[PDB]
RNA sequence: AAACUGCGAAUGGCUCAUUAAAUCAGUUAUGGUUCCUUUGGUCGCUCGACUUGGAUAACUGUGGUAAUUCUAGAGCUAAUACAUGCCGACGGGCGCUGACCCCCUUCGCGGGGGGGAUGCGUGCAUUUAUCAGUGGUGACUCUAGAUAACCUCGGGCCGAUCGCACGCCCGGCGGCGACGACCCAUUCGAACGUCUGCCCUAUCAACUUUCGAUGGUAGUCGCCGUGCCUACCAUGGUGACCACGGGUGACGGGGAAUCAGGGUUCGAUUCCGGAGAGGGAGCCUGAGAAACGGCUACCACAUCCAAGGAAGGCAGCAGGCGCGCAAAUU
């Protein structure tokens, strides 16, 4: 499956050339009461940006939003809808911000509609400052 | 020994610049022909070359080899060395003092 | 700006100094030191504004350079030295000794003490780390880095330190029931027993504090000190005892004192 | 100069910015070190905060490790073999981080032979004729030879290492950033790492 | 100063290692009491 | 006095041209960074000279150019400038090495349990790899420990520094400071990130993208996080919840005027933050500058000139011209 890229793919912590006569996996608890998924601990994949099996640290803000697009490699677009109070008219207007968010392949069962929970981490890329922390599937969607 | 002097527009020579005209040179601390004012200042001056032409004001000449003749302004009167040594080691070397 | 600021505008100065707005454009910018800009009381402001020995700032030069003012144990010849919380200002020729503890109104009170009291101060620990060769180091609120502290001293405790040596004597654990001077926010100067530290992982931990009169309030943990075991404080308190009697109580207690004293 | 500015770049949306300020200093770029194989030329920089940074421009020695059994020795780098960045930074013999380099083995071979007392590399028939390490394959007491034999139970080397050690040239991976630190340190490839990189050398080469 | 502080902490740390072992052995004596209760 | 050295000159002051998710504001992060200074740690932890070396300035002398805060040659002479380097603590530890050696068991081979010379290496910082998992977090690939090495000649530290008061001690021991110094911390910040918030415009409806647009992977660069930049990839990213483009007599805000309650208009202007020093650009020094009462070009303008050359930057305080309806004392 892995070693698709030009360079070799491995976790930088775990050393895999102890002398013999399966690769042991590095993982950590993310904190803030979030359970690390079994897939992250069990998995074969390597992703440096995963908040369970990568070099990224989650701190500051915890947001949530509906998944919109799962198009490009290892990241998705969430869409955070909110109601901005204009005071003159004592009314609200429906606004949205759609942030790019990195989606660790420990979360495999994700569909466009699932309410994803994200945590602020160091800038992964030009537009991405959030990794995914857990996934709740859209209300009803089981079949 | 020719130690080099001034162009007839006044611009000083530059030790090892290897031309006969004037060059505009980006000078710095630890250079000839340039005293900097601010720490790190790096002005662009005119300096005359090292090749001696008939396009000079004054040459600076330092006589190394003492010849036959006495020469009336130079070797007639001796001016004694204004200051003597200050550091203890230099005094110890001058007078040939021991280390006890 | 393209480098660090060296001035401080009088109107930009922290409110608790109680500098006016007609003497000058500038306030004294505190010299870099143990305490923060917004939390320190500079020496000049403790000499010419509060105690009123000096009149000008050149007077404070003529007092501090004579090596009389001994802030927590050591002589200071810097007119803008940041004296801050719990620090002991010893003016030796008058035989006077002051501890910088907050009045229940935000400002630092002038609180005189006994020289026997002046020998020690009380320091909130900021953090603990383990130094170069398993050596436990210990950083306080006035940055007094202490090597080899007692191992039962944790992050938010206090330590009664002797000024003449700079060694710990006794330490108050951050536990529920212990006295608390609040050293930040709206509740600045308030005194009361710690009731419930409420943990907020990733965010700031709020800490409820019940008063001596029962007027319970709350604060962010970072703004909270501990001054005593249970109800008994380890310092002498400034008059009012960190209660903050209300504007109505202040008014009728001014009226009562204004008539009764005469 | 050569700038490291976020503000010269188009926004997420695709709309392009205007500069509100001119190039700041703290957005330095500096030209690439582009360090080569050769006799040591390490220039120093002065960087943000009056700190030093060691521009390697030529670098040959490197403190490479042999993780399998913990030893790490200063060794001469001989070639750049493969780079996962560019195919040109192999043609142009440029040491960068995560370069694959041929290094000498003789410090590692001297160690292996001065710890396990087993001739490693070295074809059959080809003896050590000068009599240097024939002395350091024998000549113990009773219980010291016993200790070496108890240790010698765990001296099986991999087939790939055993083949590389024969040529006197191991494959190692630069873990340092020679342009920054001025060192060409790293680790010797073993196992599925070495299988992967030998397949990539074989893929590009033939 | 380095030597005296090291010894003076070593005696204080020793004292708190005896306090910690008495607390440890009390909670393992409570495990022997939860088998007895 | 001068002069070398050190420190500052990156603050203050001025102005508001540019700038419309920028700036700015509230709100967090820095477990992603840097930090002169102060403050407190640390500063015989390394097992390996009672003080060293060459200058250079001020000074004296010889000048040259029409001219500059221009500088040249010569003769001396200092350092907390510039280098260079010990003794001490210091005697030994601790890891490998391993000659040699004593004992117990087997009649003996063998297996264990003790001392063991010489040699190697050793501290904090550095860079890489490996092993175990003191104190700490909500979470570290944290801090600390162990191993193996490295340690740049454009070079980390480990004090060749200076003052007051003088003493004790059959020559040795010390007080009160000053300055210096690697690293940790602290203060002062800075820098880049989080969340949410901006005027008019659709006679601007699709825009961005193999001269990087959004993302992946590996480097380079950078103080560090990041398409910041390179190489190979993937085809993304944004928009009728108004993107994208254009305009603004647009620096943002705290605030100002008006005012039943809602509002409307203003904010160049003394506090905060940003920006710029005629326009762009590049850089030296330094902890901090892409500095302009620093330098280097180009463009525009303009000064002095023996016509060879040199010097300039008031959107600092005054003041002058010009521009204007419009604004003060060299």
Task: Explain what the structure shows.
This is part of a larger assembly, with one copy of chain A (143 residues), two copies of chain B, one copy of chain C (262 residues) and one copy of chain D (206 residues). Chain A is mainly beta and 143 residues long. Chain A has one helix at residues 38-42, and strands at residues 62-69, 75-86, 91-97, 100-102, 115-120, 130-136. Chain A is built from one helix and six strands; from the N terminus they run H-E-E-E-E-E-E. In chain A, strands 1, 2, 3, 4, 5 and 6 form a six-stranded antiparallel sheet that branches. The longest helix of chain A is centred in the first third of the chain and has 5 residues, at 38-42. The two termini of chain A are 28 Å apart. With 100 residues, chain B is mainly beta. Chain B has one helix spanning 88-94, and strands at 6-7, 22-26, 44-48, 56-58. In chain B, the strands form two sheets. Chain B has a two-stranded antiparallel sheet with strand order 1-4. Chain B has a two-stranded antiparallel sheet with strand order 2-3. Chain C folds into three domains: 1-116, RNA-binding S4 domain (Structural Genomics Hypothetical 15.5 Kd Protein In mrcA-pckA Intergenic Region, Chain A); 121-171, Beta Barrel (OB fold (Dihydrolipoamide Acetyltransferase, E2P)); 174-244, SH3 type barrels. Chain C contains four helices and 18 strands. Chain C has helices at 43-51, 57-64, 115-118, 247-261, and strands spanning 41-42, 69-71, 74-75, 82-83, 88-91, 96-99, 111-112, 120-130, 136-140, 146-147, 158-162, 167-172, 179-181, 191-198, 206-210, 217-220, 228-229, 232-233. The longest helix of chain C has 15 residues, at 247-261. Chain D is built from six helices and seven strands; from the N terminus they run ββββαβαααβαβα. In chain D, strands 3-4-5-6-7 form a five-stranded mixed barrel. Chain D has a two-stranded antiparallel ribbon with strand order 1-2. Chain D is α+β, with helices and mostly antiparallel strands. Chain D has helices spanning 88-91, 106-113, 142-152, 159-167, 178-181, 191-205; strands at 41-47, 51-58, 61-65, 72-83, 99-104, 169-174, 186-188. The radius of gyration of chain D is 23 Å and the shape is elongated. Chain D folds into three domains: 1-30, no CATH class; 31-105 and 169-206, no CATH class; 106-168, Ribosomal protein S8e, subdomain (Phosducin, domain 2). The interface between A and D is medium-sized, with 15 and 16 residues. Chain D binds one RNA strand of 330 nucleotides through strand 1, strand 2, strand 3, strand 4 and helix 3. Chain D: Its main location: cytoplasm. Chain D: Keywords: Acetylation, Cytoplasm, Isopeptide bond, Lipoprotein, Membrane, Myristate, Nucleus, Phosphoprotein, Ribonucleoprotein, Ribosomal protein, Ubl conjugation. Chain D: Pfam families: Ribosomal_S8e. Chain D: It is found in: Cytoplasm; Membrane; Nucleus, Nucleolus. Chain D: It is a lipid-anchor.
């Amino acid at each position: 499956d892995i070693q698709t890229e030009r360079a070799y793919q491995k976790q930088p912590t775990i050393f895999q050339n102890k002398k013999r006569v399966k690769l042991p996996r590095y993982y950590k608890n993310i904190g803030l009461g979030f359970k690390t998924p079994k897939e992250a601990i069990e998995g074969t994949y390597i992703d440096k940006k995963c908040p369970f099996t990568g070099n990224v640290s989650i701190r500051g803000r915890i947001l949530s939003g509906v998944v919109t697009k799962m198009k490009m490699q290892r990241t998705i677009v969430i869409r955070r809808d909110y109601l901005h109070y204009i005071r003159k008219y004592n009314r609200f207007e429906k606004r949205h911000k759609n942030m790019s968010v990195h989606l660790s392949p420990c979360f495999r069962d994700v569909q466009i509609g699932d309410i994803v929970t994200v945590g602020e981490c160091r800038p992964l890329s030009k537009t991405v400052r959030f990794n995914v922390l857990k996934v709740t599937k859209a209300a009803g969607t089981k079949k | 020994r020719i130690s080099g002097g001034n162009d007839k527009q006044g611009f000083p020579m530059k030790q090892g610049v290897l031309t006969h005209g004037r060059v505009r040179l980006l000078l710095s601390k630890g250079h000839s022909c340039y005293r900097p004012r601010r720490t790190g200042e790096r002005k662009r001056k005119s300096v005359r070359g090292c090749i001696v032409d008939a396009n000079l004001s004054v040459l600076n000449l330092v006589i190394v080899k003492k010849g036959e003749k006495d020469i009336p302004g130079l070797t007639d009167t001796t001016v004694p060395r204004r200051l003597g040594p200050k550091r203890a080691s230099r005094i110890r070397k001058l007078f040939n003092l021991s280390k006890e | 700006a393209r480098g660090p600021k060296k001035h401080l505008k009088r109107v930009a100065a922290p409110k608790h100094w109680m500098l006016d707005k007609l003497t000058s454009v500038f306030a004294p910018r505190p010299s870099t030191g143990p305490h923060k800009l917004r939390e320190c009381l500079p020496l000049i402001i403790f000499l010419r504004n509060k105690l009123k020995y000096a009149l000008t700032g050149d007077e404070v030069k003529k007092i501090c350079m004579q090596r009389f003012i001994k802030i927590d144990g050591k002589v200071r010849a810097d007119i803008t030295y940041p004296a801050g919380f719990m620090d002991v200002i010893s003016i030796d020729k008058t035989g006077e000794n002051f501890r910088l503890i907050y009045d229940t109104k935000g400002r630092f009170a002038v609180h005189r003490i006994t020289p026997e009291e002046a020998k020690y101060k009380l320091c909130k620990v900021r953090k603990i780390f383990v130094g170069t060769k398993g050596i436990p180091h210990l950083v306080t609120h006035d940055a007094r880095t202490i090597r080899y502290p007692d191992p039962l001293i944790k992050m938010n405790d206090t330590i009664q330190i002797d000024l003449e040596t700079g060694k710990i004597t006794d330490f108050i654990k951050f536990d529920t029931g212990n006295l608390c001077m609040v050293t930040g926010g709206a509740n600045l100067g308030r005194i009361g027993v710690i009731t419930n530290r409420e943990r907020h992982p990733g965010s700031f931990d709020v800490v409820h504090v019940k008063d001596a009169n029962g007027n319970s309030f709350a604060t962010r943990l970072s703004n909270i000190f501990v001054i005593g075991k249970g109800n008994k404080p380890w310092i002498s308190l400034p008059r009012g005892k960190g209660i903050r009697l209300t504007i109505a109580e202040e008014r009728d207690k001014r009226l009562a004192a204004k008539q009764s004293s005469g | 100069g050569i700038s490291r500015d976020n503000w010269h770049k188009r926004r997420k949306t695709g709309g392009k910015r205007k500069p509100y300020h001119k190039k700041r200093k703290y957005e330095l770029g500096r030209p690439a070190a582009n360090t080569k194989i050769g006799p040591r030329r390490i220039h120093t920089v002065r960087v943000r905060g009056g700190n030093k940074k060691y521009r390697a421009l030529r670098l040959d020695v490197g403190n490479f490790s042999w993780g399998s059994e913990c030893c790490t020795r200063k060794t001469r780098i001989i070639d750049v073999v493969y780079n996962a960045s560019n195919n040109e930074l192999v043609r142009t013999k440029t040491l960068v981080k995560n370069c694959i380099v041929l290094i000498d083995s003789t410090p590692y071979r001297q160690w292996y032979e001065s710890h396990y007392a087993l001739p490693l590399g070295r074809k059959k028939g080809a003896k050590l004729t000068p009599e240097e390490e024939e002395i350091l394959n024998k000549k113990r007491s009773k219980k010291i030879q016993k200790k070496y034999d108890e240790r010698k139970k765990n001296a099986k080397i991999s087939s790939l290492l055993e083949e590389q050690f024969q040529q006197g040239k191991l494959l190692a991976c630069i873990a340092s950033r020679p342009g920054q630190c001025g060192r060409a340190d790293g680790y010797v490839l073993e196992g599925k790492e070495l299988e992967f990189y030998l397949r990539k050398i074989k893929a590009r080469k033939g | 100063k380095n030597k005296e502080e090291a010894a003076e902490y070593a005696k204080l740390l020793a004292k708190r290692m005896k306090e910690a072992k008495e607390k440890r052995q009390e909670q393992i004596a409570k495990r022997r009491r939860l088998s007895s209760l």
